[PDB]
Symmetry: D2
Subunit: 221 residues, 4 copies
């Protein structure tokens, strides 16, 4: 996957209920240090018995079968954007939550001092600014970063607002010291659902913090 | 309806996930002063475009077609226990919230000084204690009360808990100065869902605060 | 419950997607002789491991907890109208099928020769005609009948169609030789769901064939 | 996508409720000659006001926004596998029915005489046999075929059955005269749902019949 063309980017203005994206990145993420799955619905998703403000259970649809089973019996670290509307678990569970990927091993992956990272932002071609974000994981979830990144630009540069966004088009780009570059369109298809958009974290992509970079691009358009 | 029999009272011990009742009466209720429905799904429910922490829309299932259509063009005050698991609205609605009944006119039904009402608590026959609860409405949603009443006992006499309850059988009894008397088992069937239990507030029973009395009967068993 | 008033009746002209009612009574009902529940979802419903063209599982929401348990270990004869839109069973079960009540014991309740019952139809004050319906059960589900009855009038007097109905109002009245009389409105509220209408059979009302009578009242209007 | 490895194939023995696959392929597919979409839920799916025995409406999730929109205003021919458990449409549509892909232009793409295509079957390495399948389309959905192929083997070589499979591993492979080859795993992961599986049809892959070939590999294992 190479750098996107200006004709592939979803434009905010078009998206219907866009606020439903706001809440995703404005509200705190789900975080759980060292845990282990318990039940699982489909051979490609895992469940965890963790609690939170709005949940007493949690599922995470991973890339596929092979991946799911791999973390079935491993103490992991979860960091994901959850969604509620259209989330399923135990035939008997109200107070469910859902996420995709965001799962990374625990032992031998949690650092000493948080390796901050520089996120370069480009508004209309010109590099207006840059900021920092932290992490603990030597190997972090693509997701994690994106959030922390967005969360910021959402509280300081009003990326998403309970309503129209200040930017027409925006995408986040990752640069692993050795792998290919990739990106996520900050905006959904005109008509979307939380569940459907959040599949951008399903591949549960992971990359070394120490060696990866991050570039953001937006259009004041 | 007349006073129950100790064999018709649901017993807490039996109830599975009982906490799902807890969260209902522990967390803040749904309040909305003077509003008017907008769209409506079924001829017996109305929708209100209100806002809350976890919702931007709201549905309320009432007794039937008649009643619904009755409050459609009327400004009203809403006060009700909301559930989330199994709540529907607009095909394009994420962040939904529901409730049963809990609707009362607004104009000419709001007092000056909150009329305080005394509830007589009886633990195992003996009238252990009594407490107060307020309102504003001349004609109150049976619901409202029930809530306020449970909320208290819960935070003070540990009615419901995030887990097993201290009590086994308990029910609230209302007594209208000229109407019959009725009650609501404080405990759902062994296997229930929020949406199903809360239906007790469907008839949207209303009564005059000035003349009506309340009694609660619990069992330490 | 006494005979209705011409203002309490629903009007087929109002009903939106009326066809959804057609099908219900057009297509074959659900029949299963001598069986036993297996699993159960909510304290007040039972699941049967039976099959039909479009289902390998079947749930039946009964009146209350009490009633449910009562048939949990009894060989019964099911006979009822099923619906698929909005039916829940096993977290893993696709091809579900739900119905309300329609459960009657099996042993010592089935006859030799079917007792034909006469239904008196009335179109606009005048008793235009009457026909016969069969059954085997000494004690039958209020349901069973109503179907057989409707079914008929639909293939012969086109009660329901894939669209507008020839009639505007109509209801079926049952007359137990000793109990009270009661009825069902042939037309739902203007905006309904199969699930929500079919509950008229939840009480699982049963009556003796030998002694009961049926009368229908329609309007050409 | 090159030929799979014997470790990448899902094994029926494992698969849970497997029958659910049977049904999809045992009962008639969904066909519609020359039609046009009307409404649409997500920017990447379309809806058609078509009628079948179990549906008065039909949705079809395609590859993405672009594709959908492309076929939005065109007379198309639908050919595809429909699943019901978990199919969504209009907030007011019961009797829904979904499918992925299976959409192809209509005008100029339909033939005179059905070009029969030969499929090569290989049971345990040996090509025990081969058979023919028809079609009208100059360009066919990968789907159509896969179905007809399976449907066949299913009534003649007991591929699937209302239960365990006579085979353990099987996949259909397609071969374009100028494009890359690919395949579909005849079996779902151990725990699946119709919805999820049928997705292998989402890319709405299409290809010229006159030049394409079909192979099938299974194992009696």
């Amino acid at each position: 996957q190479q750098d996107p063309d200006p004709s592939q980017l979803h434009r905010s203005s078009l998206v219907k209920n866009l606020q439903n994206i706001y809440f995703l990145y404005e509200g705190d993420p789900v975080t759980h240090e060292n845990v282990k799955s318990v039940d699982q619905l489909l051979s490609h998703d895992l469940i965890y018995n963790v609690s939170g403000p709005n949940y007493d259970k949690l599922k995470t649809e991973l890339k596929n079968q092979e991946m799911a089973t791999l973390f079935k019996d491993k103490n992991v670290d979860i960091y994901g954007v959850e969604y509620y509307h259209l989330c399923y678990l135990c035939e008997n569970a109200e107070r469910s939550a859902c996420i995709y990927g965001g799962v990374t091993n625990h032992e031998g992956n949690h650092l000493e001092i948080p390796k901050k990272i520089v996120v370069k932002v480009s508004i209309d071609g010109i590099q207006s600014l840059s900021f920092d974000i932290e992490t603990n994981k030597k190997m972090v979830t693509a997701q994690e970063l994106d959030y922390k990144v967005r969360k910021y630009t959402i509280d300081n540069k009003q990326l998403y607002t309970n309503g129209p966004s200040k930017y027409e088009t925006g995408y986040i780009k990752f640069i692993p010291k050795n792998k290919e570059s990739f990106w996520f369109d900050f905006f959904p298809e005109p008509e979307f659902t939380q569940s459907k958009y959040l599949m951008i974290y399903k591949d549960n992509e992971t990359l070394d913090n120490k060696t990866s970079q991050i570039e953001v691009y937006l259009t004041t358009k």
